[PDB]
Amino acid sequence: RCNTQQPGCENVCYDKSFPISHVRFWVLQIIFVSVPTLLYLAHVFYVMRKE
Amino acid sequence: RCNTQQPGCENVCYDKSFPISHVRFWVLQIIFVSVPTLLYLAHVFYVMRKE
């Protein structure tokens, strides 16, 4: 909520206040820190096949 | 009219702009201008009545 009457000021002021929400930032953080471990599986299913 | 939602903002922002209006200013001017002429006029009548 903003304290004005000019149409559209709420949209641009909310856009400036929040360039990205915290929850989607945390979702991207959860995604980006899990995929380093998957290559470990790419070792295991490799070497067992060689075994 | 003013570009805000705060109640009472119009009442003070109008009052700062116009501490007096022009049409009430010119009446106060034109009375003070013509006070001495009617003073002289009513004085001369009494002096003529005395003589």
UniProtKB/Swiss-Prot annotation, chains A, B:
Please list the tissues where expression of this protein has been recorded.
Expressed at intercalated disks in the heart (at protein level). Expressed in the fetal cochlea.
Outcome of altering S34Y? In ODDD; de novo mutation found in a sporadic case
Membrane-spanning residues = 25-45
Its post-translational modification remark reads: Sumoylated with SUMO1, SUMO2 and SUMO3, which may regulate the level of functional Cx43 gap junctions at the plasma membrane. May be desumoylated by SENP1 or SENP2.
| Cell compartments where the protein resides | Cell membrane; Cell junction, Gap junction; Endoplasmic reticulum
User: According to the UniProt entry, where is the signal peptide?
Assistant: none
**Which consequence is recorded for altering R24H?**
In HSS; overlapping features with oculodentodigital dysplasia
The segments annotated as topological domain Extracellular are 1-24
Provide the disease association from the record.
Answer: Oculodentodigital dysplasia: A disease characterized by a typical facial appearance and variable involvement of the eyes, dentition, and fingers. Characteristic facial features include a narrow, pinched nose with hypoplastic alae nasi, prominent columella and thin anteverted nares together with a narrow nasal bridge, and prominent epicanthic folds giving the impression of hypertelorism. The teeth are usually small and carious. Typical eye findings include microphthalmia and microcornea.
The subunit field of the Swiss-Prot or TrEMBL record says: A connexon is composed of a hexamer of connexins. Interacts (via C-terminus) with TJP1. Interacts (via C-terminus) with SRC (via SH3 domain). Interacts (not ubiquitinated) with UBQLN4 (via UBA domain). Interacts with SGSM3 and CNST. Interacts with RIC1/CIP150. Interacts with CSNK1D. Interacts with NOV. Interacts with TMEM65. Interacts with ANK3/ANKG and PKP2.
The entry's family comment says: Belongs to the connexin family. Alpha-type (group II) subfamily.
The protein's role, per its UniProt record: Gap junction protein that acts as a regulator of bladder capacity. A gap junction consists of a cluster of closely packed pairs of transmembrane channels, the connexons, through which materials of low MW diffuse from one cell to a neighboring cell. May play a critical role in the physiology of hearing by participating in the recycling of potassium to the cochlear endolymph. Negative regulator of bladder functional capacity: acts by enhancing intercellular electrical and chemical transmission, thus sensitizing bladder muscles to cholinergic neural stimuli and causing them to contract.
**Name assigned to this protein:** Gap junction alpha-1 protein
User: Where does this protein come from, organism-wise?
Assistant: Homo sapiens
- From-to range in the entire protein, with total length: 53 to 103 of 382
